[PDB]
Coordinates of C-alpha atoms and ligand atoms in Angstrom, one line a residue:
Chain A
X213 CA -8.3 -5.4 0.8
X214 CA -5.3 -6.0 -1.5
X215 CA -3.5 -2.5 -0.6
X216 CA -0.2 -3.7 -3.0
X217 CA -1.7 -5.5 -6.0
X218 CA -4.5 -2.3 -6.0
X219 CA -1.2 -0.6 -6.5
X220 CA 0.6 -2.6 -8.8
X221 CA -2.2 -2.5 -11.2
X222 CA -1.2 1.0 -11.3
Chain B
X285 CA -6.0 -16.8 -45.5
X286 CA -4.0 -14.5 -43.1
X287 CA -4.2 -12.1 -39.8
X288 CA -5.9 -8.7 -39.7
X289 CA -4.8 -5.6 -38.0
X290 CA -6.6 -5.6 -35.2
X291 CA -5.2 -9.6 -34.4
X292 CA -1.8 -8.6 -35.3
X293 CA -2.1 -5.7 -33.5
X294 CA -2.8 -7.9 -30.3
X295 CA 0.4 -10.0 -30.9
X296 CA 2.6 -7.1 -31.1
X297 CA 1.5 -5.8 -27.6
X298 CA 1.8 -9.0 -26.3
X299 CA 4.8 -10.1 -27.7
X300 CA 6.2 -6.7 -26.5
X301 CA 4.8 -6.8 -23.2
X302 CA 6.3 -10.6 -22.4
X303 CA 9.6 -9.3 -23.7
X304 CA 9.4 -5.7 -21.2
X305 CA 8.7 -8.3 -18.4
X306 CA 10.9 -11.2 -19.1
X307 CA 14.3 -11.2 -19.0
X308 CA 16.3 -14.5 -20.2
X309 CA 19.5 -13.2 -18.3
X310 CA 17.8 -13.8 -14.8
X311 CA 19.6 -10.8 -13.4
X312 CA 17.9 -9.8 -10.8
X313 CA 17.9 -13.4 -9.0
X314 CA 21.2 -11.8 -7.4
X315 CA 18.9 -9.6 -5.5
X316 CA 16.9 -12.5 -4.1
X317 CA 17.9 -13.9 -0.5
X318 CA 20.5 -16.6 -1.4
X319 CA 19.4 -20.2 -2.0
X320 CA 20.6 -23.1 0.1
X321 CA 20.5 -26.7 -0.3
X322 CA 13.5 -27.5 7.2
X323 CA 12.5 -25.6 4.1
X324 CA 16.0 -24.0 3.3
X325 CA 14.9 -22.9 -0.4
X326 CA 11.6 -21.3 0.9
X327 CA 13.3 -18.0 1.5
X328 CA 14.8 -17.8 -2.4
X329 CA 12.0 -19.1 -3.8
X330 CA 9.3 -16.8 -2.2
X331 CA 11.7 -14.2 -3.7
X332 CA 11.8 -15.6 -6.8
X333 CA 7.4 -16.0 -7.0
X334 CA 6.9 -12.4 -5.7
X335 CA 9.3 -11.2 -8.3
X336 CA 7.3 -13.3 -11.4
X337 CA 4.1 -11.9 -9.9
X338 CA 5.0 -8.4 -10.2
X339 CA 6.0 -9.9 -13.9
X340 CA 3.2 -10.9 -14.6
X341 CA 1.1 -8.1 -13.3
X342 CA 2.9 -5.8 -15.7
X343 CA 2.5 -8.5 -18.2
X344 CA -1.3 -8.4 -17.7
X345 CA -1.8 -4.6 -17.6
X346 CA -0.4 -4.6 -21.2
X347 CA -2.9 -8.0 -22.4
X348 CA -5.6 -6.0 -24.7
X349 CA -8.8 -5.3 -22.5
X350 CA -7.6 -6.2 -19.0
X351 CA -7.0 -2.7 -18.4
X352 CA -10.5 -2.0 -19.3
X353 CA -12.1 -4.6 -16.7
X354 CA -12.9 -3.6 -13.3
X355 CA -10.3 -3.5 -10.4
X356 CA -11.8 -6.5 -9.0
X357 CA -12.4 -8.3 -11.7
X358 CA -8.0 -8.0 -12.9
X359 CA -7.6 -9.0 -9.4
X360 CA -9.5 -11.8 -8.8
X361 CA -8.0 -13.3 -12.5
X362 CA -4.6 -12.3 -11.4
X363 CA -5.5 -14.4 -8.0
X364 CA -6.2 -17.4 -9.6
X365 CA -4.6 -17.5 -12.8
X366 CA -0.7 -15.9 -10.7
X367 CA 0.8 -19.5 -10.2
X368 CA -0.1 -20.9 -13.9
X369 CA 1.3 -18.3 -15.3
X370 CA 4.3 -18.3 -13.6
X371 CA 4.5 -21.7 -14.8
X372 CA 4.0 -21.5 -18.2
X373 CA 6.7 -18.7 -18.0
X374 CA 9.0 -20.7 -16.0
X375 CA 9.3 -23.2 -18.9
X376 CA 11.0 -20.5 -20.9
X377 CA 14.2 -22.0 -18.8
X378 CA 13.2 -25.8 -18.1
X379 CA 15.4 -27.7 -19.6
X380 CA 14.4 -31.3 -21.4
X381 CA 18.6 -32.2 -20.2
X382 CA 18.8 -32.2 -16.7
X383 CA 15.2 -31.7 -16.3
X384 CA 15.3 -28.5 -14.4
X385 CA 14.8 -24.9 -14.5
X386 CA 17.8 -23.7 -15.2
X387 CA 18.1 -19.8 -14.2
X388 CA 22.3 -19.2 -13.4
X389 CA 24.9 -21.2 -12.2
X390 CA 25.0 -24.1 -10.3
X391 CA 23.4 -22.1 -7.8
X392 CA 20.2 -20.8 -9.9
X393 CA 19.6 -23.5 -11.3
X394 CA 16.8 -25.5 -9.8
X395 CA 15.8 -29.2 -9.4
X396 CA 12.6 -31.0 -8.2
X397 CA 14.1 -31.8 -4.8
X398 CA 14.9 -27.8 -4.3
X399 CA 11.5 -27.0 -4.4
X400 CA 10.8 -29.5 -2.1
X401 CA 12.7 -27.8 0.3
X402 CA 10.6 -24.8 -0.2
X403 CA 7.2 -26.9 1.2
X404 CA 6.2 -29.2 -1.6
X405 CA 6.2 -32.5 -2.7
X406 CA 6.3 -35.1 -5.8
X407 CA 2.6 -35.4 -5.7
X408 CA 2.7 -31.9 -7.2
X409 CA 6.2 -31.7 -8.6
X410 CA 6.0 -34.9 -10.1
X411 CA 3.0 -33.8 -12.9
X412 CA 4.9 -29.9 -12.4
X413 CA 7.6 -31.5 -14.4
X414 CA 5.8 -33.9 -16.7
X415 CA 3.7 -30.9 -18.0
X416 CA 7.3 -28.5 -17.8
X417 CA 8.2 -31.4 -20.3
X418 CA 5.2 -32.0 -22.6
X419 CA 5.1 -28.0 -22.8
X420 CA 8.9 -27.5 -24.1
X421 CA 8.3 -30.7 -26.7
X422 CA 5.4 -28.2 -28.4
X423 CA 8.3 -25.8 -29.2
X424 CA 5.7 -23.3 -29.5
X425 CA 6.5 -19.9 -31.0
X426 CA 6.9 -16.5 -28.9
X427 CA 3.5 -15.3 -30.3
X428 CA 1.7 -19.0 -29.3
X429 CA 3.6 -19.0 -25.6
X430 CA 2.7 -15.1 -25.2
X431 CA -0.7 -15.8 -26.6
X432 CA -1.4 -19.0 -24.6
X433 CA -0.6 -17.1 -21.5
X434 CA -2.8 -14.2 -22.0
X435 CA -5.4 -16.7 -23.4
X436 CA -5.2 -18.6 -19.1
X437 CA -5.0 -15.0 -17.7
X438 CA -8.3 -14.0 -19.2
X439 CA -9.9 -17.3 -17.9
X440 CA -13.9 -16.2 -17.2
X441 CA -14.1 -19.7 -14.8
X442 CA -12.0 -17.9 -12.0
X443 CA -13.6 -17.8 -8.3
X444 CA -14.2 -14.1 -7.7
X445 CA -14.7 -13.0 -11.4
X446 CA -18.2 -10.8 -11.7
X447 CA -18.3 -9.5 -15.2
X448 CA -17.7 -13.2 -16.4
X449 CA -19.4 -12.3 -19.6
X450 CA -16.5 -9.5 -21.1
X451 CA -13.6 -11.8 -19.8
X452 CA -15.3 -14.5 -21.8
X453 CA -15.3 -12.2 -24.6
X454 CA -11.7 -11.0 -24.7
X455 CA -10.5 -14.8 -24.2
X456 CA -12.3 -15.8 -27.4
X457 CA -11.0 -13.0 -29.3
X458 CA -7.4 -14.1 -28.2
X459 CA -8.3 -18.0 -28.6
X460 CA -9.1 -16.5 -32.1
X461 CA -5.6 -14.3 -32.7
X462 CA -4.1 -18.1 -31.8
X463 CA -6.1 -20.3 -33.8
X464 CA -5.7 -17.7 -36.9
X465 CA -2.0 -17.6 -35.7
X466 CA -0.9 -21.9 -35.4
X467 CA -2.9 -22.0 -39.0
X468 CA -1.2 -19.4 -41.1
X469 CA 2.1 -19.1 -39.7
X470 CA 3.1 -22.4 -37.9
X471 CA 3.8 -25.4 -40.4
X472 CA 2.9 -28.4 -38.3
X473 CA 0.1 -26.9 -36.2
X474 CA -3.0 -28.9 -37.3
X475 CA -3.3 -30.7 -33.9
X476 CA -0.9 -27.8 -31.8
X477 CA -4.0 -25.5 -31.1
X478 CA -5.9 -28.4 -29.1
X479 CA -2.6 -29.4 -27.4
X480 CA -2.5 -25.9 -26.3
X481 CA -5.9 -26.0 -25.3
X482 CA -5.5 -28.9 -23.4
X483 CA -2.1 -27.8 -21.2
X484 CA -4.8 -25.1 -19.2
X485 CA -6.8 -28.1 -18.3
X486 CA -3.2 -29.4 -16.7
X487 CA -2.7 -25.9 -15.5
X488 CA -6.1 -26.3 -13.6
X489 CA -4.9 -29.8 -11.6
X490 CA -1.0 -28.1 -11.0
X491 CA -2.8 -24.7 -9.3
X492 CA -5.2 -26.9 -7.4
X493 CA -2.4 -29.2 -5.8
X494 CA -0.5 -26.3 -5.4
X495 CA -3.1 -24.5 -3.5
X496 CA -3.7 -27.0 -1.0
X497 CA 0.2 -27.3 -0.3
X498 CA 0.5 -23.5 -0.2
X499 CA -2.8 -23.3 1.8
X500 CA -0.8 -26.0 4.7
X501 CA 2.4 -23.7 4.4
X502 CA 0.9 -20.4 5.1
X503 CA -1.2 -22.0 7.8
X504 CA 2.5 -22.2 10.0
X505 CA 3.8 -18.9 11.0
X506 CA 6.7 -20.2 11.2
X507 CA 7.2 -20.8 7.2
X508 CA 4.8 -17.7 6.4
X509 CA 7.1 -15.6 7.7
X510 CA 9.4 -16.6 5.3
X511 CA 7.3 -15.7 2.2
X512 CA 6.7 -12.2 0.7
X513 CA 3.9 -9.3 1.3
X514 CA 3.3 -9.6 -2.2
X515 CA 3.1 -13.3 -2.3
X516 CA 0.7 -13.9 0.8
X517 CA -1.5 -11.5 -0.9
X518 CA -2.2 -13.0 -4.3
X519 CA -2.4 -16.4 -2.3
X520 CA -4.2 -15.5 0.8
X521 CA -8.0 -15.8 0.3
X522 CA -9.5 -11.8 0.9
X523 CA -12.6 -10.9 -0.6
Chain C
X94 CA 28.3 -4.5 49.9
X95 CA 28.3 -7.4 47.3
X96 CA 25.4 -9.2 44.8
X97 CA 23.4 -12.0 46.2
X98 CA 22.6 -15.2 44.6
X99 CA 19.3 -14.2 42.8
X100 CA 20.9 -11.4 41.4
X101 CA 23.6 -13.3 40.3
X102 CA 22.1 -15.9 38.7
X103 CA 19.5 -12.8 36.9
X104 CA 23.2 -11.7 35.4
X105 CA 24.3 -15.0 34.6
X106 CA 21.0 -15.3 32.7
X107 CA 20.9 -12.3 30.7
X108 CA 24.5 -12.6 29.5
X109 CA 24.2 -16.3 28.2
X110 CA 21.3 -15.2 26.4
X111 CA 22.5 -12.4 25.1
X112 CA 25.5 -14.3 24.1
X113 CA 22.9 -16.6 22.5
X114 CA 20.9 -13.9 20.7
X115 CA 24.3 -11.9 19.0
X116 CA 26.5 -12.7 16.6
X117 CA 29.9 -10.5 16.9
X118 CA 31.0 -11.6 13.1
X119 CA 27.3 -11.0 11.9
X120 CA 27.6 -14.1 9.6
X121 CA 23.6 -14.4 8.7
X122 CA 24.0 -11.3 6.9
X123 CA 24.7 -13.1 3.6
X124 CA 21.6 -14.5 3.8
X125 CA 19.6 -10.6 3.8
X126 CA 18.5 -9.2 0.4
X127 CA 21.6 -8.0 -0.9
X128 CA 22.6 -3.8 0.2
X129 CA 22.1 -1.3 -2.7
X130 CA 23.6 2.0 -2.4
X131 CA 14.2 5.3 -4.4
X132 CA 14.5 3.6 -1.0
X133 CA 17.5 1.0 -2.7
X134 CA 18.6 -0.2 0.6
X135 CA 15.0 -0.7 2.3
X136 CA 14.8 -4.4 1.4
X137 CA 18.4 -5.3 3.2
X138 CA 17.8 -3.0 6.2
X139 CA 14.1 -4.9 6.7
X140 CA 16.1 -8.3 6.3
X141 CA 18.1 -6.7 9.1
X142 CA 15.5 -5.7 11.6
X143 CA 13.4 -8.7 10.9
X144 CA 16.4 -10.8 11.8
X145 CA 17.2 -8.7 14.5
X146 CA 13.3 -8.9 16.3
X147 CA 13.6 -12.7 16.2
X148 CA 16.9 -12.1 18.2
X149 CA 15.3 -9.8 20.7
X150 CA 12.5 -12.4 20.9
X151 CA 15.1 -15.4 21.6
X152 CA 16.3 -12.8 24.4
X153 CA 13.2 -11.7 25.7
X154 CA 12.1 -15.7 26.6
X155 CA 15.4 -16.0 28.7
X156 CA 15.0 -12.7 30.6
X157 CA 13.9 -13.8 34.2
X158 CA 9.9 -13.4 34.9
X159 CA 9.3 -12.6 31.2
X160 CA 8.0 -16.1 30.2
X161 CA 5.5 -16.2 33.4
X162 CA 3.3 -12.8 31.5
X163 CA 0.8 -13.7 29.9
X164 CA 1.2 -13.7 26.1
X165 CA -0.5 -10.0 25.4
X166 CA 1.8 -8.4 27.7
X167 CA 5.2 -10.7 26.2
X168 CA 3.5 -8.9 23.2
X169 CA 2.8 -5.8 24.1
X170 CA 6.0 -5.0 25.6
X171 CA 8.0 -6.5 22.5
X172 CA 6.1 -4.6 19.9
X173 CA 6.5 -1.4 21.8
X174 CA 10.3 -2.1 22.5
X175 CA 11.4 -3.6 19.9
X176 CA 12.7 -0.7 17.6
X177 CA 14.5 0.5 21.3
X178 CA 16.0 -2.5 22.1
X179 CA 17.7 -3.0 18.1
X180 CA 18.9 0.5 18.5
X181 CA 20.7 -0.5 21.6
X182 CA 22.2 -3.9 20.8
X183 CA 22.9 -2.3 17.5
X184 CA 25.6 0.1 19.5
X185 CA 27.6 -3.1 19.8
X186 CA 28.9 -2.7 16.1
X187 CA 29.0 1.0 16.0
X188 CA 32.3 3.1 15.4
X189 CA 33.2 6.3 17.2
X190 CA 35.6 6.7 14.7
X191 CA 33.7 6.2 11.0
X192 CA 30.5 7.0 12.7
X193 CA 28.7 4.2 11.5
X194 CA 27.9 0.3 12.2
X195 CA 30.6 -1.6 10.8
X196 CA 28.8 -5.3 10.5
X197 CA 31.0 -6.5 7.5
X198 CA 32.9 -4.8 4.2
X199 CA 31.9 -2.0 2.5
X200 CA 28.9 -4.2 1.8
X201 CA 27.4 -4.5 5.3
X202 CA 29.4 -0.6 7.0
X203 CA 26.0 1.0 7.2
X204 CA 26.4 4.7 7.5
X205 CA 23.7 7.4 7.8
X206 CA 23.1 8.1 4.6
X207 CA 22.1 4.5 4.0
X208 CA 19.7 4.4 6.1
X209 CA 17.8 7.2 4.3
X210 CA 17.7 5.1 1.3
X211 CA 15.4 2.8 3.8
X212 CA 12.7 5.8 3.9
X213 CA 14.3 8.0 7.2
X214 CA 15.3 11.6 7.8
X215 CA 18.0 12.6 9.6
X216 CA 15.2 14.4 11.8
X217 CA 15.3 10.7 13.2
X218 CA 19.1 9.7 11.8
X219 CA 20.7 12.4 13.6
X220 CA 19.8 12.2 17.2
X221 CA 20.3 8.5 16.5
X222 CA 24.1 8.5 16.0
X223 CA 24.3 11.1 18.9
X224 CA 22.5 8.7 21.3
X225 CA 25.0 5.8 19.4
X226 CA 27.8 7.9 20.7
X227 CA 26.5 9.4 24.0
X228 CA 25.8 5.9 24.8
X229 CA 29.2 4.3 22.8
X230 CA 31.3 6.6 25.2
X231 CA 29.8 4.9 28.3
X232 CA 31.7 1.9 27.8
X233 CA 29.7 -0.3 29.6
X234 CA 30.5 -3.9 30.7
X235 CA 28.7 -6.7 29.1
X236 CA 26.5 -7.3 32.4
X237 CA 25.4 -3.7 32.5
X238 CA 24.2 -3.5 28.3
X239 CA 22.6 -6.8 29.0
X240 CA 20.9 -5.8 31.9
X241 CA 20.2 -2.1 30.3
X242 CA 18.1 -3.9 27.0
X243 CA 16.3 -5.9 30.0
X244 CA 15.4 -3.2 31.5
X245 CA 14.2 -1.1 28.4
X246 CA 11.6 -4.2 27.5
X247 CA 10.1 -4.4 30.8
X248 CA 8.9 -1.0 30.5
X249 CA 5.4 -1.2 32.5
X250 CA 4.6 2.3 30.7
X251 CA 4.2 0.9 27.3
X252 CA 1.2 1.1 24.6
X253 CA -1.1 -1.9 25.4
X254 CA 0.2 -3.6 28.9
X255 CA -2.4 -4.4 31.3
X256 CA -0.8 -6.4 34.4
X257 CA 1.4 -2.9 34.3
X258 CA 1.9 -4.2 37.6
X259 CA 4.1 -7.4 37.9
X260 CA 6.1 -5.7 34.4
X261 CA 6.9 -2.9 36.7
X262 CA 7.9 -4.9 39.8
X263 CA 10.1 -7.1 37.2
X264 CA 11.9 -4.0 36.3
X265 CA 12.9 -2.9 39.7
X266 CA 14.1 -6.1 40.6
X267 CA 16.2 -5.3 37.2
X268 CA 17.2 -1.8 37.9
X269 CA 18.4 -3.4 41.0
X270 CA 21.4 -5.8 40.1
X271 CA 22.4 -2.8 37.6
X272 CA 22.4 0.0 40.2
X273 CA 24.2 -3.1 42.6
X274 CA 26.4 -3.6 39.8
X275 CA 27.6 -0.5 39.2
X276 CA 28.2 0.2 42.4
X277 CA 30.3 -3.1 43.1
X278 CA 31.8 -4.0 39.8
X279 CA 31.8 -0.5 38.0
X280 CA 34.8 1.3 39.3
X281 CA 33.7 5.0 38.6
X282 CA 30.1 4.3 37.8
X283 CA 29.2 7.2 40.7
X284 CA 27.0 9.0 38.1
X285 CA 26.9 5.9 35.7
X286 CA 23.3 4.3 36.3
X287 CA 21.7 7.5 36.1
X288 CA 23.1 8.7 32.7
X289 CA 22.1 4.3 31.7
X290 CA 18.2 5.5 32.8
X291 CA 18.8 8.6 31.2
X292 CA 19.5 6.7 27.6
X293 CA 16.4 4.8 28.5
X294 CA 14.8 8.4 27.9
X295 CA 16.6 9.3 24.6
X296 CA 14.9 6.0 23.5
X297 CA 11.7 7.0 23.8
X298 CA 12.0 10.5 21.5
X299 CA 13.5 7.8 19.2
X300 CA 11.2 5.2 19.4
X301 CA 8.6 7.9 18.8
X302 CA 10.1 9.7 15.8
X303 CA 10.8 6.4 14.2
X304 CA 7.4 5.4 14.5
X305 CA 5.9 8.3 12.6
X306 CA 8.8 7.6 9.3
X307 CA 7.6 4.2 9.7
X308 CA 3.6 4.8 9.7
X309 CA 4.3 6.7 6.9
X310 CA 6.4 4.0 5.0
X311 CA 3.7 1.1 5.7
X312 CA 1.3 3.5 4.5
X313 CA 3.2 3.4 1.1
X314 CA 2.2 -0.1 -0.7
X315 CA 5.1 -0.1 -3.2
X316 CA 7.0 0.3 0.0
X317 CA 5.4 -2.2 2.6
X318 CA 5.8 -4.7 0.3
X319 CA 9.4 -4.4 0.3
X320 CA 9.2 -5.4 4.5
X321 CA 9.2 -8.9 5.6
X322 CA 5.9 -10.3 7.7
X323 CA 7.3 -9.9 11.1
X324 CA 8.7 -6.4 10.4
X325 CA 4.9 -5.5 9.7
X326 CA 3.5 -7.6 12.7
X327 CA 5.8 -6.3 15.2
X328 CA 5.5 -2.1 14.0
X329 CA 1.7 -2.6 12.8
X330 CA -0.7 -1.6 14.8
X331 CA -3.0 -4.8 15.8
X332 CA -4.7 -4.8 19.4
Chain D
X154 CA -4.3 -11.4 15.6
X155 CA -0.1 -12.2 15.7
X156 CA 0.7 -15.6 14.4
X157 CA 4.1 -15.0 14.1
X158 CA 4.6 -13.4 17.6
X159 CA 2.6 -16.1 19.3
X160 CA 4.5 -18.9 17.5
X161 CA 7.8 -17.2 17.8
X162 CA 7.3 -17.0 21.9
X163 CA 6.8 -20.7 21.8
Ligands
LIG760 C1 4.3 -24.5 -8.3 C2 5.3 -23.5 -8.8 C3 6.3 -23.1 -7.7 C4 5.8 -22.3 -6.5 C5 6.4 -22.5 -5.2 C6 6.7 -21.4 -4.3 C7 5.6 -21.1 -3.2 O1 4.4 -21.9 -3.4 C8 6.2 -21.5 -1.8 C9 6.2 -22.9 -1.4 C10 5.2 -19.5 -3.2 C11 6.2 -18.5 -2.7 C12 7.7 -23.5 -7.8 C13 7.8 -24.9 -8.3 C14 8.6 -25.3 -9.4 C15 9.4 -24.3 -10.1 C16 9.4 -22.9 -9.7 O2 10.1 -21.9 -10.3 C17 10.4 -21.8 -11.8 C18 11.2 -20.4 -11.9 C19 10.0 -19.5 -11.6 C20 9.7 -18.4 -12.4 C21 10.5 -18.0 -13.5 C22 10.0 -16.7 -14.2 O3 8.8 -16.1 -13.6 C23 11.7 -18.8 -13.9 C24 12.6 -18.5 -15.0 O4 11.9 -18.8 -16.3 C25 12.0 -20.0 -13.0 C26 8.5 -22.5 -8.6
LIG761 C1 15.7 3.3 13.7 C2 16.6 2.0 13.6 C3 16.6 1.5 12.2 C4 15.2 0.9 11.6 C5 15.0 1.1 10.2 C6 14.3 0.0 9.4 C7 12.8 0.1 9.2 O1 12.2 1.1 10.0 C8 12.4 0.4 7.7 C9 12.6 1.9 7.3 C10 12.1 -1.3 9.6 C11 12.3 -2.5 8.7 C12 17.8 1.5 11.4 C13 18.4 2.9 11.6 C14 19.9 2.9 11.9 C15 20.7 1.7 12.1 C16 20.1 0.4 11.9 O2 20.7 -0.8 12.0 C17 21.8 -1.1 13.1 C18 22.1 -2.6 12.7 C19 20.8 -3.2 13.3 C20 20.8 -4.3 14.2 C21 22.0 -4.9 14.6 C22 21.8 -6.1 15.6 O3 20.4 -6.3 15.9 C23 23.4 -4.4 14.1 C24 24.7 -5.1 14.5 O4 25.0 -4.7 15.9 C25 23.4 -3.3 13.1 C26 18.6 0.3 11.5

């Protein structure tokens, strides 16, 4: 998954 | 001979980038849950990792041609690469004196034994702060430090990494912006570049003890409840 | 009339533990994320309700027949409750007067507006202080909130119980000592225990609403990542 | 799953 770092990495 | 555009080009971003993302003040650590001297540093220092990771994330958007790579590729470097870094950045307040990292007051300012109470021991600490040491004696400059950290970032030997073959390339042109770099502008660097070379291989035997002590940790609910969203998904194993 | 023995003993019970669970001077509030008055305050007010569900937990073990369910229904009940039973032991710091919960300084005197800088509307905010004050202006004794929260976690009609049936025998045997109580203790409590079930009702439209901010919230990386583990076990949705 | 829960009933 990786819901937050997918978003982090903008 | 001297550095080209395109090399000096790559040290200004970086530079730049470690400097948008760092910030020798520690400032924020006020916004952490409290330390306190059962694993009664675990809450601060969870705080204090998830906060370095989103560092280093924004560090790592701004390395030139991470952005580039695939979305699983800058995740599964960021994955495996997260706790050297934050290492390597971390020395940027060890201290050679007391021998700790020394972030604020009396209260920020850590020891080995504090980050024992967060779930670790000397077995990982103890070459932690032998390498914290041997680092700060290489006084490196803020273009080797910022170099040498986007140079363990874009590591092609990291489990989950596909296109192996254009992270290889984009750590050899940085190895090159370095070597180019400790040969024209650092008087004194004729071994410094292997030295360098050499603290990743360190790095490799720190986030593997790590790992396994982290790995015990987050196995009790009772201590990963402690940690971070953030933090339990850069360390947690998710394909 | 008078109480018997057993029902006695259930009010003895639920008072020590509540005693046990509750903190009048809310002195582990230092050791939240600091307040910040973008969502500033979500990371204290998670910190809060985290701290809060492991309180509600610690209560939930002591309430008689609870630890004989098996563990999906102690589950079940406590992940559909939860938000319901903070909201109610939450009353115990709010003010009639400033219309907000008064926990500590200006630091920790949470006030509506607050808690829309966690990611709520006063769609939910609104009918919250309402039921703060409907149920603030009830002045009930210590035996009947205790007994009230009790009441509100064995809730047979919840989201994912199965033995529906023992949960809802527990709670008559429950809604007895109160309505007993009331009715022997209480002097003017004549209409009393129903306005108590009625609050019981209010709960629900505000267990609901909350639920849908909240979905939406967890929905939100940047903002899920700002909850604590627990916080996203207890209001996720996991069978 | 609910680690945390589980543990946390004791
Ligand atoms: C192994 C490294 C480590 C991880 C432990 C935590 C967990 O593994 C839980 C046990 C994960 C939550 C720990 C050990 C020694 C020192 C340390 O912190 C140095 C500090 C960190 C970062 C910065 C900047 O990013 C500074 C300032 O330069 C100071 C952290
Ligand atoms: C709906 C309720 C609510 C949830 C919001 C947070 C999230 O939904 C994220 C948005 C979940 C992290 C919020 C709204 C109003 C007041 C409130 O706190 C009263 C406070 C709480 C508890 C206690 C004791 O347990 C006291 C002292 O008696 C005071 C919390």
């Amino acid at each position: 998954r990786h819901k937050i770092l997918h978003r982090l990495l903008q | 001979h001297m550095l080209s555009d395109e090399q000096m080009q790559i040290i200004n971003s970086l530079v730049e980038a470690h400097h948008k993302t760092y910030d020798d003040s520690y400032s924020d650590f006020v916004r952490f849950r409290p330390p306190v001297r059962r694993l009664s540093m675990l809450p601060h220092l969870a705080d204090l990792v998830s906060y370095s990771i989103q560092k280093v994330i924004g560090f790592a958007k701004m390395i030139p041609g991470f952005r580039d790579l695939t979305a699983e590729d800058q995740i599964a470097l960021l994955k495996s690469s997260a706790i050297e870094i934050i290492m390597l950045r971390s020395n940027q307040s060890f201290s050679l004196e007391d021998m700790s990292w020394s972030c604020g007051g009396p209260d920020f300012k850590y020891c080995i034994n504090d980050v024992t109470k967060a779930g670790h021991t000397l077995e990982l600490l103890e070459p932690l702060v032998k390498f914290q040491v041997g680092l700060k004696k290489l006084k490196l400059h803020e273009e080797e430090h910022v170099l040498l950290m986007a140079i363990c970032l874009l590591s092609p030997d990291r489990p989950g990494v596909q296109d192996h073959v254009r992270i290889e390339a984009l750590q050899d042109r940085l190895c090159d912006v370095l070597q180019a770099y400790i040969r024209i502008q650092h008087p004194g660097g004729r071994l410094l570049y292997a030295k360098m070379i050499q603290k990743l291989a360190d790095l490799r035997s720190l986030n593997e003890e790590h790992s396994k002590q982290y790995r015990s940790l987050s196995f009790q609910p009772e201590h990963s409840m402690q940690l971070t969203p953030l933090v339990l998904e850069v360390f947690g194993s998710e394909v």
